[PDB]
Structures are given as structure tokens and as C-alpha cells.
Amino acid sequence: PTSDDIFEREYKYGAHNYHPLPVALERGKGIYLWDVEGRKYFDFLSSYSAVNQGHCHPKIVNALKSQVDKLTLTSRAFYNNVLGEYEEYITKLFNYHKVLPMNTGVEAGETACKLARKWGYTVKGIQKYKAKIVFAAGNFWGRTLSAISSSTDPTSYDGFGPFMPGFDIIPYNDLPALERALQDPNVAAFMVEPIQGEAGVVVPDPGYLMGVRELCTRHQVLFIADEIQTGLARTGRWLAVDYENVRPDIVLLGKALSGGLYPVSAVLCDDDIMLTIKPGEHGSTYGGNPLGCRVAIAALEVLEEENLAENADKLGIILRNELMKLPSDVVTAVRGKGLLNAIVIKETKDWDAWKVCLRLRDNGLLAKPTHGDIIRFAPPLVIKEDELRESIEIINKTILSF
Amino acid sequence: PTSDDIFEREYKYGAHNYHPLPVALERGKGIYLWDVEGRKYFDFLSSYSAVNQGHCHPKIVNALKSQVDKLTLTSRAFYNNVLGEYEEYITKLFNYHKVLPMNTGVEAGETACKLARKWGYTVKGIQKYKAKIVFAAGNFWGRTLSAISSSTDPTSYDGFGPFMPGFDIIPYNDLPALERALQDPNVAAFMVEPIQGEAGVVVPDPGYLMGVRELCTRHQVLFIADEIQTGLARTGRWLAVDYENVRPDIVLLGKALSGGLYPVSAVLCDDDIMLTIKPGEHGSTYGGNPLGCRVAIAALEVLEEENLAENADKLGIILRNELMKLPSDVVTAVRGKGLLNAIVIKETKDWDAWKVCLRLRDNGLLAKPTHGDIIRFAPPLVIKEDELRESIEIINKTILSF
Ligand SMILES: *[C@@H](c1c(COP(=O)(O)O)cnc(C)c1O)[C@H]1CCC(C(=O)O)=CC1=N
Numbered sequence: 001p002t003s004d005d006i007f008e009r010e011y012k013y014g015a016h017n018y019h020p021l022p023v024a025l026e027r028g029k030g031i032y033l034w035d036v037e038g039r040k041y042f043d044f045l046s047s048y049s050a051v052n053q054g055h056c057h058p059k060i061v062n063a064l065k066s067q068v069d070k071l072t073l074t075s076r077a078f079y080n081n082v083l084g085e086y087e088e089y090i091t092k093l094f095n096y097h098k099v100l101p102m103n104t105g106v107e108a109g110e111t112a113c114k115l116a117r118k119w120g121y122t123v124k125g126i127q128k129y130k131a132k133i134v135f136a137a138g139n140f141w142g143r144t145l146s147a148i149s150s151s152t153d154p155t156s157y158d159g160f161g162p163f164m165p166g167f168d169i170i171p172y173n174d175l176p177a178l179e180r181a182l183q184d185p186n187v188a189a190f191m192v193e194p195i196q197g198e199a200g201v202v203v204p205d206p207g208y209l210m211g212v213r214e215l216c217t218r219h220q221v222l223f224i225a226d227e228i229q230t231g232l233a234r235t236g237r238w239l240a241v242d243y244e245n246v247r248p249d250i251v252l253l254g255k256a257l258s259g260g261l262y263p264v265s266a267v268l269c270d271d272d273i274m275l276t277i278k279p280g281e282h283g284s285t286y287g288g289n290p291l292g293c294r295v296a297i298a299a300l301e302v303l304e305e306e307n308l309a310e311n312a313d314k315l316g317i318i319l320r321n322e323l324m325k326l327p328s329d330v331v332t333a334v335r336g337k338g339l340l341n342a343i344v345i346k347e348t349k350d351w352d353a354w355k356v357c358l359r360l361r362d363n364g365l366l367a368k369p370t371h372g373d374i375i376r377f378a379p380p381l382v383i384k385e386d387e388l389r390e391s392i393e394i395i396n397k398t399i400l401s402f
Numbered sequence: 403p404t405s406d407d408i409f410e411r412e413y414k415y416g417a418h419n420y421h422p423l424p425v426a427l428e429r430g431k432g433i434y435l436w437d438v439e440g441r442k443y444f445d446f447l448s449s450y451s452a453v454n455q456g457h458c459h460p461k462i463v464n465a466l467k468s469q470v471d472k473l474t475l476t477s478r479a480f481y482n483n484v485l486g487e488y489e490e491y492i493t494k495l496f497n498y499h500k501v502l503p504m505n506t507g508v509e510a511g512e513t514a515c516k517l518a519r520k521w522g523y524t525v526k527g528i529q530k531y532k533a534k535i536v537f538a539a540g541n542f543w544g545r546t547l548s549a550i551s552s553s554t555d556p557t558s559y560d561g562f563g564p565f566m567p568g569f570d571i572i573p574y575n576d577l578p579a580l581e582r583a584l585q586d587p588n589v590a591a592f593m594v595e596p597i598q599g600e601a602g603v604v605v606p607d608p609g610y611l612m613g614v615r616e617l618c619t620r621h622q623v624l625f626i627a628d629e630i631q632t633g634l635a636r637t638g639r640w641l642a643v644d645y646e647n648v649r650p651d652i653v654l655l656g657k658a659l660s661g662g663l664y665p666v667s668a669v670l671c672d673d674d675i676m677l678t679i680k681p682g683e684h685g686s687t688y689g690g691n692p693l694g695c696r697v698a699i700a701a702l703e704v705l706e707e708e709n710l711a712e713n714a715d716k717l718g719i720i721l722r723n724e725l726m727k728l729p730s731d732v733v734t735a736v737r738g739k740g741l742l743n744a745i746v747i748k749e750t751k752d753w754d755a756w757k758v759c760l761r762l763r764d765n766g767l768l769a770k771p772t773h774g775d776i777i778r779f780a781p782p783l784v785i786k787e788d789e790l791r792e793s794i795e796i797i798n799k800t801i802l803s804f
């Protein structure tokens with residue numbers, strides 16, 4: 001069963017909603033992936049930062065294998081013995097009263113929108129269905145109809161019917177535009193990524209998160225931090241907002257919340273927001289099931305016990321320092337925090353980001369481009385310095401071979 | 403850690419978006435659940451029909467255990483070796499060209515709306531963003547902003563900001579209403595449940611689905627069948643639409659697609675619909691991951707090998723026949739197909755459906771009310787006749803005890 005057979009089988013029986021890098025993995029462990037021919041690659045995508053803990057981490061695997069024999073799903077129509085233990089752990093770890101469990105990142109994002117609107121009408125006193133939520137251009141938080149209604153990427157929203165009203169969009173990294181938008185008293189919330197992931201690891205200016213927090217507080221607007229990709233040690237802190245000591249009203253977690261073993265997402269906020277949703281008013285079949293909760297407890301324990309936030313911080317400085325040694329004729333910019341980084345490519349007639357990742361793949365490193373001239377570098381946080389430096393030499397020789 | 407401690411911990415650290423039946427489970431096997439005091443119960447909810455195969459089915463457990471050691475998540479930015487195998491299996495099983503993999507049921511629903519709209523514009527030629535989707539009153543398909551915009555239940559949508567435009571609502575089980583609504587040439591699709599689940603197991607008249615299929619075909623409108631709860635043997639057929647031999651344009655599968663071991667959902671349709679979505683225009687991080695694919699193959703194999711569909715059909719007939727022996731002015735109606743059934747309570751204020759379920763629990767059977775006078779009975783399809791008859795006498799004893 002060859003890589004080419006794998007490509008063709010999906011081409012016939014699967015939807016064409018993705019254009020993947022031509023590589024066919026069958027095994028993964030830590031920072032490494034193997035294709036069906038047995039080739040080894042460095043994973044520098046981490047499945048969009050979902051395997052921060054590395055592929056098939058034994059503690060998370062053990063948690064899954066232990067729980068799957070006892071009980072995997074009662075639905076939240078009944079109680080089980082695991083959900084509450086996870087809820088107490090995650091709320092005390094991040095210091096919010098309550099967590100609302102969901103499965104995927106979009107669902108957490110949708111939950112936060114519902115919380116923001118419900119808070120807007122029942123607490124702030126906005127007249128019903130005039131509540132607005134402000135988003136930042138370049139934002140990506142999934143592909144439901146509501147999520148693409150806030151996007152500024154035509155590939156995401158074009159052709160997908162009329163869009164959800166009440167979503168305003170302002171430039172990213174722009175405190176005066178935020179203040180202008182918050183003059184409207186019908187605004188209920190501002191949702192923003194501390195670093196925009198799918199936009200190309202767009203790091204805002206120092207002080208932006210402090211300005212957002214101040215502006216949101218000044219105008220009584222919920223600050224929703226989407227940490228589904230930047231959180232859980234990826235940028236060198238528990239949350240990327242920690243860099244500016246900023247406390248959002250709602251935090252969104254996901255992806256790495258399970259080490260890649262189970263779709264688990266979470267919405268954290270205090271009682272005055274969380275309890276605006278009453279029994280019967282929100283839910284999810286698989287949300288908060290005991291199997292995903294066991295996995296998530298183990299995945300959080302891994303990040304803490306192995307000190308992955310500090311490892312990501314320390315190794316991320318090395319990565320960016322070395323990447324900045326590449327000549328400015330070929331690499332125009334290097335940006336990121338911790339182990340979430342990107343380079344900007346001098347796009348010409350000779351090459352683009354897809355061609356570089358094709359050659360990076362040939363040299364044993366898997367990375368994906370974000371839109372034509374940008375390459376993301378996001379390896380699992382369990383990578384060690386020597387593995388990192390070997391990775392860098394692969395990136396150096398690949399980039400300079402064009 | 404008692405049952406009361408578990409209730410109290412979740413009350414403190416978990417959102418209050420549910421009010422569950424007060425029972426705290428810690429083990430499940432087949433048709434049975436055990437609570438933390440060791441009491442044994444019949445499961446007559448099956449986690450909203452997600453454990454058709456019974457709790458912790460060993461073949462599905464083994465598939466999960468086998469795959470988690472190899473590879474659990476690459477994202478669809480790369481290929482893995484499992485997805486295409488699952489895609490070929492599920493598309494040939496249901497005889498559609500392609501499948502689009504998602505995680506939760508509402509994600510499958512959102513995918514179908516996006517397919518319907520993009521097909522409406524690019525194939526049918528509706529002017530952009532005039533495309534409409536018709537729903538039936540009483541429909542439930544999740545709690546995203548778009549899912550609740552189609553809902554007629556105020557508890558689902560009240561307070562949740564402005565709603566998605568382009569959604570129309572007609573009565574269920576009403577062919578003249580559908581015919582009137584399909585006079586609008588901007589309708590792209592009609593989405594309907596073959597049996598409405600959360601509305602209270604509302605079974606439409608014989609011939610409704612044939613008339614839906616004919617009317618949709620007559621007016622060039624996509625027939626989207628939501629089989630997330632009714633499918634996969636629950637009603638006594640592979641799909642509830644099989645009872646009338648109708649072939650929808652889009653089939654939604656979920657819940658039991660994994661036996662409750664992983665959030666897996668699927669959207670099935672032919673190339674002319676599926677291929678309206680181009681690479682980069684839809685996706686999800688965990689959609690199509692190798693772990694969920696493996697358990698979904700095993701879950702579908704269980705339904706076939708153990709012939710659960712014909713077991714559900716045969717035992718459902720016994721269940722409804724016995725329940726109709728209860729006094730007519732205490733149990734006012736019995737309805738359902740296969741092992742998706744419900745009874746309607748002669749609700750006074752000396753009792754309601756919630757009180758009956760509390761006493762059902764006291765007598766060893768776990769069920770949930772859906773409307774105050776309706777109780778759903780949906781045990782796993784691996785239930786045997788003698789186990790079902792003991793369950794019936796629990797119900798008989800409970801109902802006749804008031
Ligand atoms: C399940 C349901 C869905 C929702 O799927 P999911 O997002 O996985 O919960 C979609 N379509 C149908 C026919 C269906 O029955 C239910 C039942 C549970 C539930 C909840 O707890 O929120 C709501 C649903 N719509």
C-alpha cells in the first residue's frame with residue numbers, strides 16, 4: 001500500500017476540501033513521523049499545535065487505555081465520575097470559576113459567542129438581538145457558518161450563503177480601531193487571538209493585549225481570548241496572554257488540551273458570565289465525556305510535569321535567532337513566540353512557500369505554508385536542543401538550495 | 403467519593419447548561435451502567451443513541467487501543483494511511499460517491515448547510531446569498547448559532563443574539579407545507595429528520611419521506627436527511643429512510659458512528675454536490691483523524707456482524723406492544739420505530755415525566771424526559787429479549803406505582 005495508492009483512494013472516496021502536502025504518514029512518536037515507505041520526518045506542524053506533548057505520549061495513551069475499558073460516554077443527561085475531577089483541575093489551574101466542556105475549537109468559539117450575547121442581553125441590558133461581537137481581521141477560529149461570517153479570507157466565506165449578522169471586524173494590532181468600535185454600547189464582546197495562527201503567526205505589538213484588556217474593561221465589553229492554538233505552553237507560557245499579565249473574561253482552549261488523542265475543547269469564565277446560560281440552553285452530545293476528560297487531565301499533567309512552557313520559550317529563542325541568520329534577500333522576516341514561529345519568504349518567479357515545503361519534506365521535515373510566502377515552524381514542545389539544531393540545519397540547507 | 407459529592411463538584415466548577423438526572427455512573431458494559439455506589443441500571447437513553455453497540459464494545463475498544471499506539475492525529479494538512487480506508491468503506495456501505503469527515507453531529511449539519519448553499523449558487527444558479535434552507539419545526543441538530551437559528555424551541559434560541567438569515571421553518575409531517583415552501587426558486591435544500599428525536603420521537607405518517615423525496619426532486623431542491631440519531635440500525639434499518647426506500651441527496655451520520663468511543667460524524671453525497679467545495683474551503687482540525695476512523699470502521703462492522711438492525715426491529719415491536727398494555731389514561735400514547743421509542747404521560751401535577759424517571763432510576767432503569775409529559779426509551783441494540791422483558795416490567799412497576 002504505497003503513498004500514491006493512499007493519495008488516489010482519498011481522491012476517489014473523500015471530499016476535496018483539503019489540498020494536503022503529498023506525504024502519507026502511518027506512525028508518529030514524539031517529534032517524529034513515519035510515512036508508509038518508512039521515511040522519518042521532523043513534524044514542524046504539530047497538527048496545528050494539537051500535539052504539543054508529542055505524538056502518542058505514553059501518559060496520555062495510558063489514560064485513554066485505562067478509561068476506555070470502564071466508561072466512555074453517558075452524555076451530560078447523567079453524571080459520571082470523571083467530568084467533575086477534570087472541571088476542578090482545569091478551573092483551579094487557570095483560575096476561573098467554571099468551565100464549559102465542548103469537543104472542537106469551533107464549538108468553544110460558538111459557545112463563547114453565545115455566552116457573550118446572553119451576557120449582553122441579561123446583564124449589560126442590550127436590547128435583544130442588537131448585541132455585537134467584534135473580531136480582528138485575519139482571525140481564524142473554524143469553519144461553521146458563524147465562524148466564517150467573521151472571516152476576512154474570501155476562500156473561507158465566498159459562496160457560503162448569507163452571513164451571520166452582528167459580527168464587526170476591525171484591524172488586528174490596532175488599539176485606536178478597537179476603541180472606535182467600542183463606542184457602540186451594543187457591543188458585547190471582542191474575540192481575538194493573542195497571536196494570529198492561521199494568518200501566519202502574526203504577533204501584535206508589545207502592549208496590545210494590555211490595551212485590549214484596558215479598553216474592554218473601560219467600555220464593559222467581554223474580552224474573549226482565543227488560546228486554542230497559542231495556549232498550553234506553545235508560546236512559552238501557560239497562556240500567551242501571560243506575557244502581558246492580562247486576564248481575559250473568557251479563555252478558549254482546545255487542540256493540545258488532549259495531546260491529539262481526543263477532540264476536547266473548553267470555555268473558561270467566572271460565574272457572572274457562565275451562569276447566564278441555564279439548564280437546557282446549551283450542550284453537546286460528546287461534550288465533557290469521561291474518556292476525553294481523562295485524556296485532558298493527563299495532557300495537562302504532561303505540560304506541567306515536563307516543563308514544556310519553559311522548554312518552548314528557551315528553544316524558541318534559539319530557533320528565531322538561527323533563522324534570522326538567513327540572508328534578508330531570501331527570508332524577509334522571522335516572527336513568533338515560544339515554539340510558534342514563521343518565516344516570510346521572498347516570493348519570486350522561481351519559488352514560493354509550497355515549493356520550499358516540498359523540498360523540506362524531501363529532506364525529512366514536514367511544514368506547511370499559510371498563504372504563498374509564509375512557512376510555519378511549530379514542532380512538538382518535547383523537542384530537545386540537539387534535535388532542534390538538526391532541524392535548523394535541514395531548514396538552512398533547504399532554503400539556501402533554491 | 404459518593405454520588406452527592408459528584409453532584410456538588412460539578413455544581414461548583416462546571417457550567418450549568420444541563421440539569422442531569424441525579425445518578426453518577428462510573429462503569430458501563432453493553433446495556434448496563436453502574437453508579438459509584440455499585441448499583442446496576444438498564445441504560446434506556448444510550449447517550450442520545452450514541453451507544454447503539456452497547457457500552458465499551460470490545461471490538462471497538464480493541465480498534466481504539468490498537469490505533470492509539472501508532473498514530474492519532476496528523477491533521478488533514480498531511481495524509482494518513484487510515485482515512486481513505488474508512489472513506490472507501492463507508493461510501494460503499496451507503497452507496498454515495500464521497501464522504502466528508504467531521505467530529506460532532508452539529509458539525510455535520512453545518513457542513514450540509516454549506517454544501518447546500520454552495521451547490522445552490524454554483525450549480526442551481528441562485529443569486530449569491532439569496533439561497534434558503536427549509537427546516538421542519540421541532541428539529542434539533544445541535545447548539546451552534548446556526549443550528550439554533552433554525553429551531554422553534556425558545557429554550558434553544560432565546561437570548562442568543564441575532565440569528566442566521568436564509569432559514570425557513572415549516573411544520574413537520576406536512577407535505578402541503580413543503581410544497582408551498584418549495585415555490586420559492588431560491589430554496590436550495592430541505593433538511594429533515596426521518597424521525598424527530600429531541601422533539602419527542604415524533605414519527606411522521608407513512609409516505610411522508612416518499613413525498614419529501616418527490617417534492618424536492620420536482621423543484622430541484624436538495625433532500626438532506628439527518629440520520630445522526632435515527633441511523634445505524636437504531637430504528638430497525640441501516641437508515642430510517644430505508645423504511646420507504648428513499649434516497650436522500652445528503653445523509654448525515656454521527657453519534658453511534660463510533661459506538662460512543664470518539665466524536666465522529668460524516669456527510670455523504672455524490673460528486674456533483676460534494677465537489678462544490680474546493681480545497682481550502684472547509685475543514686476541521688480533528689476531522690478524519692486516524693484514531694476516530696479506526697473506531698468508526700469497527701463500529702460499523704459491529705452493526706453489520708451482529709445484525710443489530712433486525713434485532714432493533716424485532717425487539718421494538720415487542721417493546722411497543724407491551725407498553726400499549728399500560729392504561730390508556732395514564733400512558734396516553736406509545737410511538738417509535740425499532741428501538742427509538744417514547745411514551746406520552748397523562749401529566750397532572752401529582753406527577754410528571756421527571757418524577758417518573760426518578761422512580762425509574764430507583765427501580766434500576768435510566769431514562770430521560772424530553773418535554774415534561776414524554777419519556778424516551780432507547781436501550782442499546784445489543785439488548786436481548788429477556789433483558790428487554792425485565793426492563794418492561796421495571797417500567798410497568800414504575801408507572802403503576804403512582
Ligand atoms: C444529537 C443530534 C445532533 C447533534 O449532534 P452533536 O453536535 O454531536 O450533539 C444532530 N442531529 C440529530 C438528529 C441529533 O439527534 C442531539 C441530542 C443531544 C443534544 C445535546 O445534548 O445538545 C442535542 C442534539 N441535537
Ligand SMILES: N=C1C=C(C(=O)O)CCC1
Pocket residue numbers: 048105140141142143198684685686687
Ligand atoms: N481555525 C482553524 C482551522 C483549521 C481547519 O479547519 O483545518 C485548523 C486550524 C484552526
